[PDB]
């Protein structure tokens, strides 16, 4: 949960 | 003890007893060894011990005893040679020569007592430096003659010549006067033609390996200074690069010789010379490939095995290749028949660069930097080295060290940045592929993913923006995938940390994509709650690192955002920082301060500042209200800790905001200084009740931390203040009232050196505006601090350093304060400066010498007025003599340049007639005597008494030269260095001081 | 077909407690504290005898700077200059050979580490009393 | 017994004696007491190849206390050359110490050590330090105060002297300590010594440990 980086993924795909 | 019998010179020396003491020292142990050691030293230091040297060298059967006898003789020859009667000088020469001859004629002795022979040879050289060639013209001719009569003598002669070359060309600079050094250099140069003929004959003909090696060892020394014609117009390069590379015995020294030839002075218009330079390289590389190892060999493995002298050889090969190629690779780059040679040489270097050896890697890396920098600029060169560079990319990436070894990282970054410019496609491919092998597990490890992440991070800013953009998306998505794959917090923490590291290295990407930047930051805030070891530090470090680079994007309102993100961070700061240790919270607040300072609307900036400081300001207000109601509450260790952390938070924000911090400083300033007073009383009360040991207790240390942080906060703001009127009118008077009398009236152990440091900044910034304030500073800290540090050089080290920094800036900014001092206190000031001269501590000595110089200048600027005249009358010769003392006492060598500068300034005052009054008393010398004449007289008398072994002519010649040269520092210093040489011996030549002109 | 293939004395102890620390020894003649070592301080319980000892080694060199029984008679006392240290008398430490008495001081990275050490130290003393 | 003579040389004040003391007893001596001539200290390390013994000849760096000088180097089998990274002059003198050393010891392993890297204001920058290259010396940044790399010089020399690159320091055996039997006769003595110890502050209270 703490090291779940999916937030980074979604923001990067959104590019 | 019985051993002490050798110390009685009235009786004849018992050689058997000497050998026992020596044996006890070298082969014995414990108390016995220690006693013998002290006896031998006393024996050696007996100024008449040299007279018994011949007895020992003749009748002793212990080679260590003879070694010590030669050491005793060395001392004599080096320092008192010209004091001896002429018969003793001749006698000592004949004895040493005869001793060397006999040792060389005995094959058993020659082979088993190398240490004694080498020592004897060195001793001979010490005599040569005194006697040759002016009183020994036949030495070299006879040396060459005797070389042919015996291989042992020939070999030993090469050792003598080696040492002679070393003492004359390599180590003469600080051991001889300029004139004597030049005399000996010219002397060797005059007769080298003969010497070279011998050396070349031995190399061309000789078969004795020990002889050839010694000859090559001597040649290595010659190559430091001899004309290039001896190397290029003879056949010797052929011999070095072929014959002597094949046998391992000569290989090591030959390689060292060829490295120096790669440094010989050459013309670069002679095509014949250029062919020879190519040729010996070709030969050498050919010998390595055929006799040592092929270019494909695993040198990393070889080096690691560490067989025989393999490591030294590979080290030497690296030095040879890098040295030669850095100077001459252009010779190999045009001719197509030389291309294989060029690339083979560089392929060896690639292999050497894989060796696991830090210092060797730095050597090769220095060369790689030289190469790729050239390829980056020089037309039509990079295509030649494409395969070399591709390999180098992998080597540097795989050996990338932690950035934080700092110097090594920067060097690696620099080379890899060049390599990225040279071929950006190859670099990307290598890194992506490297990353792919982390993901499939083939090369997965915490170390390996870290290394790769540092490498990827190091090349940011190299690619053009759009190119860079595509690369980082790939890497991060790949790293993001790698993170999912791994299980357990240990593994995911590592990858997550590397994700944040790479992102933090590419701010240009972050600035162009706000949504991603936002997401990264909010993720960092999550990490600030993670107690996993290292994660919180990593989060805070990355946060401020990103802010420092992208702060502008936090202060503006972004599209589809209701407000600047800095507001959003501040709104929830309590929650975000709730799990952070104090030091981490300060970093967080400091980062916020960086952002706030970019807000150029003053009203908005102050609003942000007040909101940022809300938590500490509220905590502050409460404890100021409580601790003032009950000063005993201030004894609570918890409250003391809370108070310190509040001030530390202010320090953190003030550090990033500087001048802009003033409104927050205003909020706390008056109550803060009152707290300083309250804490000060408590400290004093505790020391009174418990004694000095109180200063060691956690309670008092906690209290003094409050005082130090308060001082730090004020110092930090004032050093960055732009409005100096406010500093003077608002801050300074309350500050001085709060800290000065407290400092003065505390016992020494309770005084904070930080007070001095704070005052230094105050004087630095606004000293010119507060003349009475500076006087008050001096009155309160000068005499009581001086008395703390003028009993020895070790006590109160921080006070000591800050003390002279403060005096230096006062002397610079408010010299008038020293003019107001009463005569007695000004005398203490002069004493204090000279006291600083005598420190070996650089942090004191340098400032002391600078204060003296600035002071003399300050006095000079005053012109012909009573104070300046009295200053010179009282203190001119004190500064001259004190400066001379530290110059000549051999315990302050580090301050030589500044000592010389000060002395030159002082002497130039007199010889420019910038001192109006007579420096002498009316009765001392006749009326009308110039200060110039009296200075020479004073100095001559001073040096005569301080250095009684110098002749009057030496002193006179030295002072005449020194005086003439008081406008040319370089020459002046040369004359001083010559003097320092001459005082170490008897009978120095006064004409040496005419060396300049 | 068979192919022939190619050709500390802490083992009997349980680690009850481990903590980073710096150990000092009091030089009564010089009247000053001298560092003896920095590294991991371990409480080791022997499996056979159930008795607990302190064993502390220096970083890198792994040389012993403390080796003695946590005797139930020992008492941890505060040092005047520290809130993260304990002072106590040891009458039989064999870190450097023959058993010898020392006045030790041991310092820790934090007060809570020092206080936990205190707790473990006393627990270990209870083990040794039985 | 496998023992090797090690000579330690370098300018006065560079930390030679402090370095050796740290290895001998674990203590850090703050005071500078100049070595007079030489002091010989046995120093043993336990390795996977058995114990190795260094007889360390800690020589005087001050000229006026030089004693036998190069006489100390005789039959040395290895050496450490020390300088101070906060003092440029000590590095400038490294070639002089090296010269005097290899004239007596023509083929021994030698470590060059830049001491006091713990001090903030470093004066001899890492990139300035290159003397060891052509002379085949091993170099290490060290600090006797913070123990940074303090083991490296001996580990490297041990590997060279034994001729085993895979030599490692290992943990010396830890004998079972004896059960305590305190003397009631010395109870007042120990309590007296304990009082003095408690009231004498530990040094360097600001350190991490
Ligand atoms: N900050 C710091 N100080 C050190 C370090 N090593 C030694 N010192 C200090 O340097 C000073 C001199 O130490 P010392 O060992 O006597 O040097 P030395 O080389 O033996 N001098 P000499 O040749 O005259 O005998 C001491 O005060 C010592 O505490 C260090 O690594 N860091
Ligand atoms: Cl010629
Ligand atoms: Mg010493």
Numbering used by the authors:
A (entry chain D): 379 to 393
B (entry chain C): -1 to 376, 414 to 439, 461 to 1053
C (entry chain B): 63 to 69, 78 to 200
D (entry chain A): 8 to 216
What does the paper say about this structure?
The exportin CRM1 (Chromosome Region Maintenance 1 protein; also known as exportin 1 or XPO1) is the most prominent nuclear export receptor in the cell. CRM1 recognizes its protein cargos through 8–15 residue long nuclear export signals (NESs) in the proteins. The NES-binding groove of CRM1, which is wide at one end and narrow at the other end, consists of 5 hydrophobic pockets P0–P4 and is virtually identical in all CRM1-NES structures. The resulting CRM1* construct, with ScCRM1 residues 1–1058, Δ377–413, V441D and groove residues 537DLTVK541 mutated to GLCEQ (to mimic human CRM1), binds NES peptides in the presence of RanGTP and RanBP1.
The CRM1-bound hRio2NES and CPEB4NES structures unexpectedly revealed that both NESs bound the CRM1 groove in opposite orientation (termed the minus direction) compared to previous NES structures (PKINES, SNUPNNES, and RevNES bind in the plus direction). Although the polypeptide directions are reversed, local structures of the hRio2NES and CPEB4NES are similar to those of the PKINES and SNUPNNES. Helices of the minus NESs are now at the C-termini of the peptides and their strands at the N-termini. The five hydrophobic residues of the hRio2NES and CPEB4NES, designated Φ1–Φ5, bind the same P0–P4 pockets as the plus NESs, but in reverse order, with Φ1 in P4 and Φ5 in P0. The narrow part of the CRM1 groove is still occupied by an extended strand motif, which is formed by Φ1 and Φ2 of the minus NESs as they occupy the CRM1 P4 and P3 pockets, respectively. The four hydrophobic residues that match the class 3 NES consensus, in fact form only a portion of an inverted class 1a pattern Φ2XXXΦ3XXΦ4XXΦ5, with M393 of hRio2NES and M383 of CPEB4NES in the Φ2 positions. F391 of hRio2NES and F381 of CPEB4NES, which we had previously missed as consensus residues, are the Φ1 positions of the N-terminal ΦXΦ motif of an inverted class 1a pattern. In both the hRio2NES and CPEB4NES, large hydrophobic residues in the Φ1 (phenylalanines) and the Φ2 (methionines) positions within the extended segments enable a longer reach into the comparatively distal P3 and P4 CRM1 pockets. Wild-type NESs MBP-hRio2NES and MBP-CPEB4NES bind CRM1 with KDs of 2200 nM and 590 nM, respectively.
